[PDB]
Amino acid sequence: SAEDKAAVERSKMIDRNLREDGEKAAREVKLLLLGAGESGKSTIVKQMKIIHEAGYSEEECKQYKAVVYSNTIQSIIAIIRAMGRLKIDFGDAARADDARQLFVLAGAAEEGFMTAELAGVIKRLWKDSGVQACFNRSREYQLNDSAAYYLNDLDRIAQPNYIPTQQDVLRTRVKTTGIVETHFTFKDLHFKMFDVGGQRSERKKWIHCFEGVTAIIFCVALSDYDLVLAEDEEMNRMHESMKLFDSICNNKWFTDTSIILFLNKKDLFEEKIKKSPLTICYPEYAGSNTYEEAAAYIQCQFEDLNKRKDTKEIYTHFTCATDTKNVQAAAAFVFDAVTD
Amino acid sequence: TEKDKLKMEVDQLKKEVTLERMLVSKCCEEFRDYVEERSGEDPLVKGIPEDKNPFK
Amino acid sequence: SELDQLRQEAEQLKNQIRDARKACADATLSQITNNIDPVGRIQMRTRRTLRGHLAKIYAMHWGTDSRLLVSASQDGKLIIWDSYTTNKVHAIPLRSSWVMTCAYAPSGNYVACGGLDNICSIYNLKTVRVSRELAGHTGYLSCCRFLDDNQIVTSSGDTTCALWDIETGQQTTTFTGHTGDVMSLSLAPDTRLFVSGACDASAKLWDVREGMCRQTFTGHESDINAICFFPNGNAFATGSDDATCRLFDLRADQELMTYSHDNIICGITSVSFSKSGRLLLAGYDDFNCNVWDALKADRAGVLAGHDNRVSCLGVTDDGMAVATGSWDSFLKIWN
């Protein structure tokens, strides 16, 4: 025919483009982040943009304004609610009125704005010694690790012309519910990094989608070791992370995938281990309660879960994911492990 | 949350309990008879002549 | 606790429903068909191989002309094929490669797809460009089917289904009730109802107009990954991680037949009836599609042309062919 020839030629042209695209895709480095909630995955993704793509524009930063405020409000609310549960009194009784007003105001707040009234309530609460006593007992409830970051900077944050900084954006907890993907180039190679931490669905229905990735970066919050085991009491948080790592590292879907282990939040760990003993997490631990020996112990507890040890190496690095210079050095570590 | 989930499940079950269900035998007969009127012309049952197969 | 009272009440109502279903199980499908002759050995051959994807294929859907079909792969491509000639008509570059479902509009004017981006994207074939990105689900898109060029229904890992107005991009209706990821849906012939299958191991029948669940069907021991209506609109089939397919009857409100064999312990990914309903075709994790006699529960044939999981399949509206798609990156056309 006439049309039939053109349809054949169209198909052949599609075939060429598909082949060229596949050849470019076979050359890219694909990195999947995994790890428990709050372990640092979305922070690492943002750090790749800051390091390799010049960070965030001012207009991009303006868009995190509303989540900075929502994060801040939810942090102080969490501390106040815990005072009732832990039976902690205010340092000044007048703060009870402020606490009441906190809840009234939080319902009336408009996104992207914080009234001077609400800012003053939060400031007075955060300064109160009873609120601070509860904050310092955060291992007994659920409190995100950026709480003090924002609350200590409330004066700057609350200005009507406030524009979030890049560090502010790094610290935000925006809960996307879908996959997050970032692309960059590092030494003439195309990298793609994925984070599914926002997905609340059933992991067994899509983990196999990542069979074939070059490497997994598994993130662990070192500072989770002393969190009290509460409603669900099968395992403490660190042992839940160990069970997930055991599952991933030894997974049939990742036989040919390099396993990188980021033992993250080392800055919070270094401070916690001064007053909170590792035995809270590992009752059998008989070493000293110091940064170096306790960190080593955790590293070995995870590395020991590798079952194909003889064929498979774990690339372990201690990180502070909110420190761009620290992440840039760990990134170099990761490059070496995967490219060759 | 969970309590809110149980209330809705209970509400839904209260509706489903009131359904008037047909005998399985009757439904099976109707299923069979629908298939029997048509399986004789079903290409994946009876096969296709080579000359009439558009995928030859 | 009040919590204690609600849990026991739910179990009591589930038991009442179980008893009422039992009170209507006066006979079984196997008895009713005892006198029908077996279909005999079904032996189909691969007639067309659709080569082009470079990674796992996750879904496919036939156009209503029984000739064109769309496939979706995590190579990041939606390909529209002319199955008669194997020519590629379109190769659409997705914005997110993590696709899990696709659909061909009955008119032939649009296709849809989505996945881990939690978005259902609509593509106009008759301008190819992204016409709409339907945002609202909080979990992956697992299945989607057009009612017409203006409305589409979706299922999601967020445990809901939704009906969308494509022009406005808004969810017109949300279908809530499943307690696990929803994996598949199928529209009734008259598009007034649809059924969904979920990781709570149940299937649900939904009223499109009134946005409510009418019936909840139970019996599977693990996730339902695939669901397909029977052509007369009064029954449907499910395929499950529990290595069984089952036939469910709407008006009996209960399971009629299980299709399984002690040999088969792997999961089922996809189910379809042949045009008459005599055959139920199912794709399996073990790389095969098994062809069941829907009336007798005997396995009548096998389709074994793949080197990895059969992830999807579909029968043409004219009944002339079945398509299989696979993690091995191929689709095959059989009859």
Ligand SMILES: Nc1nc2c(ncn2[C@@H]2O[C@H](COP(=O)(O)OP(=O)(O)O)[C@@H](O)[C@H]2O)c(=O)[nH]1
């Ligand atoms: N101090 C400190 N905070 C961190 C570190 N890594 C992450 N965070 C913070 O901890 C919180 C949870 O981290 P995020 O990346 O959102 O965890 P994700 O759930 O795995 O994505 C965020 O507020 C981060 O700012 C770290 O190494 N040190």
